[PDB]
Amino acid sequence: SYMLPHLHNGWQVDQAILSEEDRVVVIRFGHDWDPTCMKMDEVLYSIAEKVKNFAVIYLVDITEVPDFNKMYELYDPCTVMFFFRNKHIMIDLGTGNNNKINWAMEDKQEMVDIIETVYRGARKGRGLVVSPKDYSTKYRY
Amino acid sequence: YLRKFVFEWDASEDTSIDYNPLYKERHQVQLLGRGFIAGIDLKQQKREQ
């Protein structure tokens, strides 16, 4: 399915990041067949219209669009990238690297909170924002 | 009735820790005084027989 819009070349990506001025651009780098990307894209579609006011989601295929692999260290099976007014926003998830999510959370509310915090920090002017949760521990007991 | 690459085995893996005297001190083979266990020095076997 994947009703979320897709970008088929680097040109689409680099004018999609600059297209939004009052909304956070979300880019999922990965592959549809990849299950983890499947989980994240299901979560995103579950909240695609909830964050329409202040966020936008685009799906980018690594094979179709491989130019960002070296610059963004796109070596994981899947990454999630946050941009605002041409500036990347780093998120302090507690996983060691603040640039990309690199994992698929099943709860859509966690992603909603993450994108809301990113928007709040980007409109205020901070380039690095703190996640309102710690993902170092999976919280499984 | 009621990880770690370990090159050498652990001493707890040992067996033959018996309580019966018949099984702890087992009467060795004396092959008519003319047969010897392989590998061991022949002179040592002759002395300790």
Binding site: - | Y1, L2, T15, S16, D18, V29, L31, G35, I37, A38
Partner: protein, 267 residues
Amino acid sequence: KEDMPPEHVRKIIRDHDKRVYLGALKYMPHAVLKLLENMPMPWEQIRDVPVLYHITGAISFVNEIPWVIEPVYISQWGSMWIMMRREKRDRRHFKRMRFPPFDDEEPPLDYADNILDVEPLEAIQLELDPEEDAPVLDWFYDHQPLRDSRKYVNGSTYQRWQFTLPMMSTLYRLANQLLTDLVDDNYFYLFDLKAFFTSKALNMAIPGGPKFEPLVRDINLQDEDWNEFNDINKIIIRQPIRTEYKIAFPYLYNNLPHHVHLTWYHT
């Protein structure tokens, strides 16, 4: 085809369509395995071998297989045992010089430069007394003892051997250090393969024997609920029923004998 002069492969490997070279490189683990399995024995100084080498020098296999007559091989290694023990008793200051690296990072010595013209110092061959080792002293320390003799082996393939009894007696004498001189399997009572299988299938370890993970899931003896069958008030105890008793008679001292092999009785 026919064998070529050894200088041809020497020149080829000295001087060095990449597809042929890359395809030849694929079978390298066979090259390693055939080199290592044709490893010279301690009693041999030089062991010439047939070699199938790539025309581009990308690879070279040792073609032959280490065929050795079992009694002769065991006797040779028993003589090696004797000589090694004698030398270690002689040399109090034996110095190990085995080298884990190939001359470290140093380039591989050129065989035609410093190994070709150097003759070996000596071998580890045991000295054989001509009065007792008469039938074997002629060939006891050859690369293949009787390969060229039609009477003792089938032929150059070196696949069948027949020996006269004096030769086998001398070989048995020379290999007495590697044999326990047992004349029975009674020494292996409750200690042979079938006994070990019975022990493993019953999740029990012979004292001298090994120990294995349980073959089937074992229920703790504290789980049984004191039936009339296993009532301890009825059981008469004289001696502790050992693991050996249960292995010797698996169908009598075990309540669930499964995949148990009956051990051979007295011979």
